[PDB]
Amino acid sequence: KNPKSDKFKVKRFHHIEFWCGDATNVARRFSWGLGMRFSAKSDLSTGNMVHASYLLTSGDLRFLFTAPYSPSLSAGEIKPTTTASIPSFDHGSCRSFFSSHGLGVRAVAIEVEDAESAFSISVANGAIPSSPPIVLNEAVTIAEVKLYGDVVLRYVSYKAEFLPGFERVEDASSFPLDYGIRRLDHAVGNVPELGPALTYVAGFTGFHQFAEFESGLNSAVLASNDEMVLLPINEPVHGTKRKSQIQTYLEHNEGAGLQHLALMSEDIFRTLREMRKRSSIGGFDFMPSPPPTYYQNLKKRVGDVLSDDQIKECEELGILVDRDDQGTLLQIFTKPLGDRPTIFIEIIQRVGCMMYQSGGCGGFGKGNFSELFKSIEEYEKT
Amino acid sequence: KNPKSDKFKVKRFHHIEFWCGDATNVARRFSWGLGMRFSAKSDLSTGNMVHASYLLTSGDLRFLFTAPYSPSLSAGEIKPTTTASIPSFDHGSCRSFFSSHGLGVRAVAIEVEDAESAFSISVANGAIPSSPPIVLNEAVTIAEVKLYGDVVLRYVSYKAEFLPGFERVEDASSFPLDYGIRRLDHAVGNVPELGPALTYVAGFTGFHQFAEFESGLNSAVLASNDEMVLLPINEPVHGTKRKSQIQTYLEHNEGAGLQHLALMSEDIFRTLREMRKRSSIGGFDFMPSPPPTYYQNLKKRVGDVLSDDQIKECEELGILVDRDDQGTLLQIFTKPLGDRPTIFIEIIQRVGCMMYQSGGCGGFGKGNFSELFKSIEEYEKT
Ligand SMILES: Cc1c(C(=O)C2=C(O)CCCC2=O)ccc2c1c(=O)n([C@@H](C)c1ccccc1)c(=O)n2C
Ligand SMILES: Cc1c(C(=O)C2=C(O)CCCC2=O)ccc2c1c(=O)n([C@@H](C)c1ccccc1)c(=O)n2C
Ligand SMILES: [Co+2]
Numbered sequence: 095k096n097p098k099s100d101k102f103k104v105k106r107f108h109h110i111e112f113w114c115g116d117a118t119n120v121a122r123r124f125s126w127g128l129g130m131r132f133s134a135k136s137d138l139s140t141g142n143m144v145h146a147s148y149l150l151t152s153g154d155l156r157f158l159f160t161a162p163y164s165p166s167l168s169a170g171e172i173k174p175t176t177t178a179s180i181p182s183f184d185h186g187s188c189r190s191f192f193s194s195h196g197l198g199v200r201a202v203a204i205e206v207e208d209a210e211s212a213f214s215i216s217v218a219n220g221a222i223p224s225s226p227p228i229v230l231n232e233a234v235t236i237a238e239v240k241l242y243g244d245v246v247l248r249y250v251s252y253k254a255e256f257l258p259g260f261e262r263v264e265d266a267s268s269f270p271l272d273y274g275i276r277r278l279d280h281a282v283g284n285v286p287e288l289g290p291a292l293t294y295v296a297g298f299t300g301f302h303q304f305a306e307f308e309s310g311l312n313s314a315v316l317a318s319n320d321e322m323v324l325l326p327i328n329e330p331v332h333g334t335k336r337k338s339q340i341q342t343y344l345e346h347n348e349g350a351g352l353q354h355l356a357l358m359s360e361d362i363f364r365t366l367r368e369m370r371k372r373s374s375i376g377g378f379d380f381m382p383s384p385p386p387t388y389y390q391n392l393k394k395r396v397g398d399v400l401s402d403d404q405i406k407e408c409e410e411l412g413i414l415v416d417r418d419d420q421g422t423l424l425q426i427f428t429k430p431l432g433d434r435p436t437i438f439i440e441i442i443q444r445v446g447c448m449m450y451q452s453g454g455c456g457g458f459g460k461g462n463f464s465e466l467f468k469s470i471e472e473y474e475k476t
Numbered sequence: 477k478n479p480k481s482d483k484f485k486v487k488r489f490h491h492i493e494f495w496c497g498d499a500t501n502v503a504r505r506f507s508w509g510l511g512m513r514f515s516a517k518s519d520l521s522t523g524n525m526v527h528a529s530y531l532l533t534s535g536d537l538r539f540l541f542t543a544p545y546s547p548s549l550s551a552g553e554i555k556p557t558t559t560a561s562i563p564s565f566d567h568g569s570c571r572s573f574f575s576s577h578g579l580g581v582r583a584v585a586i587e588v589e590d591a592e593s594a595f596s597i598s599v600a601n602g603a604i605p606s607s608p609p610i611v612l613n614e615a616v617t618i619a620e621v622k623l624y625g626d627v628v629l630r631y632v633s634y635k636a637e638f639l640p641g642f643e644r645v646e647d648a649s650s651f652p653l654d655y656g657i658r659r660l661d662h663a664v665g666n667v668p669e670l671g672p673a674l675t676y677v678a679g680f681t682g683f684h685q686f687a688e689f690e691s692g693l694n695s696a697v698l699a700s701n702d703e704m705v706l707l708p709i710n711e712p713v714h715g716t717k718r719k720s721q722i723q724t725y726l727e728h729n730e731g732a733g734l735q736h737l738a739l740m741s742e743d744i745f746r747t748l749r750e751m752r753k754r755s756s757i758g759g760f761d762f763m764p765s766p767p768p769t770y771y772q773n774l775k776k777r778v779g780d781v782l783s784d785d786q787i788k789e790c791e792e793l794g795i796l797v798d799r800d801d802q803g804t805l806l807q808i809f810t811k812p813l814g815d816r817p818t819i820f821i822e823i824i825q826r827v828g829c830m831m832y833q834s835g836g837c838g839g840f841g842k843g844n845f846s847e848l849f850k851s852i853e854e855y856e857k858t
């Protein structure tokens with residue numbers, strides 16, 4: 095049941111901003127590893143004396159990488175005279191974020207009808223303000239509230255090309271890489287206590303709990319009216335036969351933050367082939383694959399959805415499969431994206447729920463905890 | 477004339493250490509962009525709770541990338557009980573270095589006969605100590621003195637595999653990339669005042685001035701006894717028809733630091749082909765190429781050294797050529813390696829001075845300032 099209680103009009107995920115020490119090297123690594131092209135820039139060459147920001151895109155997916163310059167370059171500036179293209183940026187906030195958490199997501203940005211109204215309504219409904227609404231070139235409005243830890247939810251609204259002050263990247267440095275990734279499906283937070291986290295976010299957005307049904311976690315999913323913005327949140331479950339990956343995250347991240355970005359592919363087979371070819375030459379590594387017992391057990395589970403050849407293609411690529419009441423989910427997880435065992439990426443593709451495909455079709459793979467556990471015990475005894 | 481005045485026995489360049497915000501992403505980017513393989517690691521998986529350090533190698537060239545973890549992981553440790561594999565490492569020093577300078581070289585490491593003697597002798601002769609000699613596993617000794625700015629000269633000596641506590645990297649993540657780079661030829665500092673810089677370094681090493689003969693700089697080169705360790709230093713020359721790149725460096729770097737690393741290739745043609753193929757897919761960009769007039773003028777200059785086909789191969793790749801009394805130098809420069817217009821890399825190959833090839837054969841390309849200037853004026857008027 096979807097009560098459609100959004101307190102303001104929400105469209106889709108707009109972009110994800112990483113706060114970096116060096117945006118150039120992170121962005122180039124991500125570009126090669128995920129097959130995203132360099133689409134826009136805001137840096138010294140565009141007049142920005144405050145921060146370096148590089149935008150990668152794949153389909154509708156937008157990854158922004160931002161790092162501060164020396165404050166001495168902009169020492170004479172004040173906010174009214176700033177050359178920053180992202181007015182919410184602050185050197186001290188950025189350095190403190192990165193020193194505290196390492197490389198990770200600062201901003202989960204969603205496009206809304208009117209960022210000013212969304213901001214005012216959110217704060218009126220309990221949201222902690224982070225950056226007030228600011229109009230860029232009388233054309234784009236941006237505002238920010240706290241989401242969890244030091245992650246903000248950023249609202250973006252357009253009167254009618256990424257952001258004013260960003261320049262389109264020259265087609266020469268813009269190699270048209272594409273491994274099939276098309277959009278952000280969901281963005282997941284890790285928190286010490288799930289209850290207060292949910293109550294707070296659902297409080298100021300009107301987002302509703304999304305339908306569901308010892309793995310180290312409890313989780314719940316908040317969704318916008320059309321369930322195209324999906325914000326799962328996890329908390330740890332302490333004490334087991336293995337340590338909670340949520341607890342490990344909080345320890346190495348120095349508290350709550352974004353755990354993983356799930357990127358929808360138009361062809362998860364080709365995406366995973368391309369990413370796996372590049373793992374050891376600058377790209378991303380993937381978690382250890384399930385044993386062959388997991389893939390034998392797939393026939394009994396999704397044999398109606400996936401042919402024997404497509405199941406064997408999942409096995410060759412380490413792809414996991416779960417299923418819902420209405421849809422089927424293919425998923426796989428990278429190793430952590432940086433030095434710390436904190437943020438990682440999920441690649442997914444959803445099968446079913448045709449109406450356009452409805453959001454969350456197939457769930458989030460929670461049934462793969464037991465299915466993975468069972469297959470691992472079976473392969474050991476085998 | 478080489479007076480051979482080294483105050484201690486110096487062997488060769490050993491490694492270069494970069495201080496990073498995220499060592500993983502910088503190291504993966506450098507690996508792909510330069511064709512260096514992952515050879516050793518010291519991180520959480522090896523028991524290091526203090527810093528993440530990844531070693532890339534190509535031939536004898538060793539690039540180390542190090543970033544701090546959260547201090548909370550090692551809060552109970554003291555230096556006698558440290559899990560750091562590099563005992564000179566300090567969280568606060570590392571974060572302060574990176575916040576101040578951005579991504580850059582912290583340590584220029586040279587192998588010596590006895591790091592303890594080299595340290596004591598250096599400090600006795602004016603060197604400012606940075607980290608005292610420390611014996612690792614009764615097998616490797618390391619010590620550090622200040623070189624310029626926040627760059628240290630690191631001494632390493634071996635009784636008889638990179639460093640104790642580093643683990644060899646699994647041949648699976650160790651893809652055997654190789655674009656032909658073989659060793660560090662020279663490492664270059666930018667300082668506000670050349671005179672005091674030279675006097676200080678030559679004072680404590682015994683390194684001698686290396687033979688030479690408005691471009692924005694003055695420079696001089698310090699060399700070890702066999703002239704295989706080469707340390708040029710630059711200072712700006714203020715006021716011209718263009719701003720000094722040395723001054724730009726000091727401004728964006730917040731003072732003195734390492735300007736460029738020059739990497740010798742066994743085949744600069746293949747190195748530049750491989751690096752240029754990768755520039756727009758995660759690798760490194762190169763400075764703008766000289767006009768065709770520069771390459772026509774090459775026949776009159778090096779036509780005895782390089783055939784017409786090899787000169788045309790230089791033109792296709794943007795390679796610069798200079799010549800000495802005894803040798804010929806092929807060189808090219810990357811764009812800056814990170815966000816700031818500070819550190820860059822030079823690729824070089826030297827022709828001549830056969831005895832083994834003697835160090836510095838062909839010089840450092842100083843004649844290419846005028847040759848580039850002339851050809852640029854000629855191409856404009858053409
Ligand atoms: C993150 C994830 C999800 C996931 O997407 C997700 C949501 O979107 C929202 C609901 C909560 C949630 O979890 C689903 C299945 C996963 C994993 C996952 O992380 N892991 C590995 C990597 C692991 C488990 C334990 C300890 C260390 C690693 C899995 O095995 N499964 C099977
Ligand atoms: C660094 C360099 C060297 C070099 O290696 C070097 C040494 O090893 C020691 C002696 C001093 C020195 O300079 C040689 C030639 C160079 C460059 C160089 O940097 N440039 C570009 C990039 C540039 C010039 C001006 C303003 C901006 C950029 C050149 O054009 N030439 C021709
Ligand atoms: Co997920």
Ligand SMILES: [Co+2]
Binds near residue numbers: 822
């Ligand atoms: Co040089």
